[PDB]
Amino acid sequence: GAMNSSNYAELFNNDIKLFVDDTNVYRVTVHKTFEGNVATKAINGCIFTLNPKTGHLFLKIIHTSVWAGQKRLSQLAKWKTAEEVSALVRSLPKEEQPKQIIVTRKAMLDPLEVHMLDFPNIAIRPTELRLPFSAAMSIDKLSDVVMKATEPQMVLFNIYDDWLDRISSYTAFSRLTLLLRALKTNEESAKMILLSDPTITIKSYHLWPSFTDEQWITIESQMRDLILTEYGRKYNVNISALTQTEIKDIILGQ
Amino acid sequence: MNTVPFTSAPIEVTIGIDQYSFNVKENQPFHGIKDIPIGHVHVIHFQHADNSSMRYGYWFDCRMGNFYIQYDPKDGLYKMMEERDGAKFENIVHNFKERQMMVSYPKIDEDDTWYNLTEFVQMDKIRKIVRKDENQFSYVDSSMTTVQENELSDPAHSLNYTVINFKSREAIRPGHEMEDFLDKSYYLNTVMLQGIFKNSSNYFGELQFAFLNAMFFGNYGSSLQWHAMIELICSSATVPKHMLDKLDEILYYQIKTLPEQYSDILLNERVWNICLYSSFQKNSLHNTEKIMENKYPELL
Ligand SMILES: CCOC(=O)N1Cc2ccncc2C1
Numbered sequence: 151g152a153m154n155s156s157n158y159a160e161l162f163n164n165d166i167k168l169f170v171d172d173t174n175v176y177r178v179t180v181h182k183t184f185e186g187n188v189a190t191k192a193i194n195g196c197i198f199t200l201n202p203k204t205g206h207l208f209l210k211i212i213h214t215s216v217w218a219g220q221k222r223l224s225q226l227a228k229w230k231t232a233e234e235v236s237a238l239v240r241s242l243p244k245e246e247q248p249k250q251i252i253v254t255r256k257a258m259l260d261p262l263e264v265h266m267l268d269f270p271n272i273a274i275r276p277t278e279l280r281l282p283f284s285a286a287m288s289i290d291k292l293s294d295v296v297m298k299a300t301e302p303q304m305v306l307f308n309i310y311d312d313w314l315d316r317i318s319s320y321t322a323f324s325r326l327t328l329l330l331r332a333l334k335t336n337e338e339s340a341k342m343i344l345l346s347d348p349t350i351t352i353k354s355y356h357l358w359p360s361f362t363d364e365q366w367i368t369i370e371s372q373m374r375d376l377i378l379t380e381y382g383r384k385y386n387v388n389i390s391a392l393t394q395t396e397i398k399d400i401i402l403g404q
Numbered sequence: 405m406n407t408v409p410f411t412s413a414p415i416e417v418t419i420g421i422d423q424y425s426f427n428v429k430e431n432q433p434f435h436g437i438k439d440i441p442i443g444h445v446h447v448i449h450f451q452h453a454d455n456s457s458m459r460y461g462y463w464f465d466c467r468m469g470n471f472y473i474q475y476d477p478k479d480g481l482y483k484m485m486e487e488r489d490g491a492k493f494e495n496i497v498h499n500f501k502e503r504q505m506m507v508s509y510p511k512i513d514e515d516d517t518w519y520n521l522t523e524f525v526q527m528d529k530i531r532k533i534v535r536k537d538e539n540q541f542s543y544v545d546s547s548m549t550t551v552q553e554n555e556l557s558d559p560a561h562s563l564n565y566t567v568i569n570f571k572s573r574e575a576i577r578p579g580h581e582m583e584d585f586l587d588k589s590y591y592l593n594t595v596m597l598q599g600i601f602k603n604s605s606n607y608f609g610e611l612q613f614a615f616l617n618a619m620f621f622g623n624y625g626s627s628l629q630w631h632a633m634i635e636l637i638c639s640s641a642t643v644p645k646h647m648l649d650k651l652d653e654i655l656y657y658q659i660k661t662l663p664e665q666y667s668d669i670l671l672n673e674r675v676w677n678i679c680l681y682s683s684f685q686k687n688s689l690h691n692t693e694k695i696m697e698n699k700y701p702e703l704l
């Protein structure tokens with residue numbers, strides 16, 4: 151059924167599964183016309199399709215040409231997402247096809263179920279989790295490949311870099327969602343925490359900096375404080391007054 | 405001018421004939437129903453006074469044979485039977501009429517209600533939905549499941565309504581996923597009308613039969629089928645003008661006939677709100693929208 155806090159270890163079992171997030175597929179800037187009307191201008195988007203066990207990210211770049219002369223674009227975007235996920239599944243060898251696809255937005259359920267009628271044994275599920283995958287476009291190297299694209303393109307990444315050499319997929323997913331939540335809440339502050347010590351760089355073949363295990367512990371702590379700091383700024387709350395139990399809950403609850 | 409005699413009425417029962425009903429007492433001298441209009445299919449139905457769970461009946465056409473009712477004390481129900489001896493049957497009916505032991509089908513001369521409910525319903529089509537080839541009449545009851553319900557147990561006792569499923573390969577052409585899901589015209593016009601039903605008259609007959617089984621028996625799978633056949637039309641951008649005009653008439657008489665006190669169990673809020681206010685055909689069902697707004701404004 152619905153993926154939640156209860157059935158969370160299920161993300162890291164040996165049943166192949168993918169998360170699909172459609173929140174960066176259809177992207178626009180809203181602007182004034184010469185006559186003082188409002189118009190949109192689309193920019194390049196992406197489907198964020200992620201294996202949470204392996205870190206394999208299928209970034210399908212959505213070029214603005216897709217939208218040319220189409221109507222009801224927010225509706226079409228869900229169906230185009232479903233079309234491309236079903237094309238990806240059909241492209242994979244049988245032993246690599248997912249057993250489950252989890253959509254981050256319940257509006258993707260019917261479009262994806264309809265495109266996957268040929269795969270009755272692939273379960274299409276919603277989730278109760280509020281996942282921060284909208285912030286994928288805060289990862290500089292992902293933003294760069296999307297905005298430079300001149301045509302439809304699929305790019306493959308490992309969103310965990312080499313982390314699984316040192317940590318479990320449970321802890322890698324934790325680190326990923328904490329980093330994306332911080333980038334979503336305060337992008338400027340998040341980037342300044344990641345990128346401020348010049349001695350620590352991003353490998354050419356990586357998305358994130360090359361932190362030692364001890365430095366990751368410090369980074370993770372600075373990200374958790376950023377999310378608390380911003381929660382205090384947003385709700386006018388004295389953070390310094392909160393307990394570790396209070397702090398604990400806001401650091402998932404969101 | 406046709407007659408369905410009863411051997412006797414050994415148990416207290418409410419008897420329906422089409423939209424009419426009356427109470428018969430345990431061992432009351434009741435010997436049946438006379439003056440049944442030729443030209444239409446009819447339904448005789450029963451609800452036992454000592455057990456309202458016993459709810460069942462028979463579809464029949466008096467043009468296809470001589471039918472009577474006889475209580476079976478083993479199976480504990482009123483059974484329809486065919487009498488093949490014409491002269492015996494004629495003699496039975498004659499005696500019961502002379503002794504005035506029969507109720508008269510109470511048709512008001514102005515009243516086209518039954519024709520309006522059964523316009524497209526034909527006994528040969530009922531016999532394909534309800535399969536029991538040794539009888540010319542068809543047994544239905546409140547608990548009988550549909551082939552579709554049995555997919556999501558005993559197949560011999562099933563209502564074989566045409567399966568409608570909006571998220572099925574039958575409903576959705578590969579490559580036209582969004583198109584076919586948001587506009588059901590393909591599924592209505594090519595698959596159902598041209599393909600399975602052959603014409604709108606057969607589609608409406610099944611729709612009307614499903615309504616009648618839902619209303620007269622409280623058959624849940626019948627109510628599901630009635631709503632699915634309405635939703636398939638209302639969700640189609642391209643429907644012939646004659647089919648929309650006829651559907652408006654069909655639904656008007658169905659909503660007219662529904663007992664006010666069963667509206668809560670027989671009408672699906674989502675489907676009616678969608679059909680009348682959001683669908684392609686939201687503006688095409690003037691008579692149905694007016695009677696629904698005036699009779700059931702709560703539901704909406
Ligand atoms: C690796 C350590 O993990 C965490 O500290 N998290 C996961 C996580 C994910 C999303 N928001 C907050 C948090 C706190």
Ligand SMILES: CCOC(=O)N1Cc2ccncc2C1
Nearest residue numbers: 525526529530606609610613
């Ligand atoms: C051919 C598939 O089924 C039909 O065509 N019917 C069912 C049916 C049941 C009662 N009256 C008319 C009809 C038309």
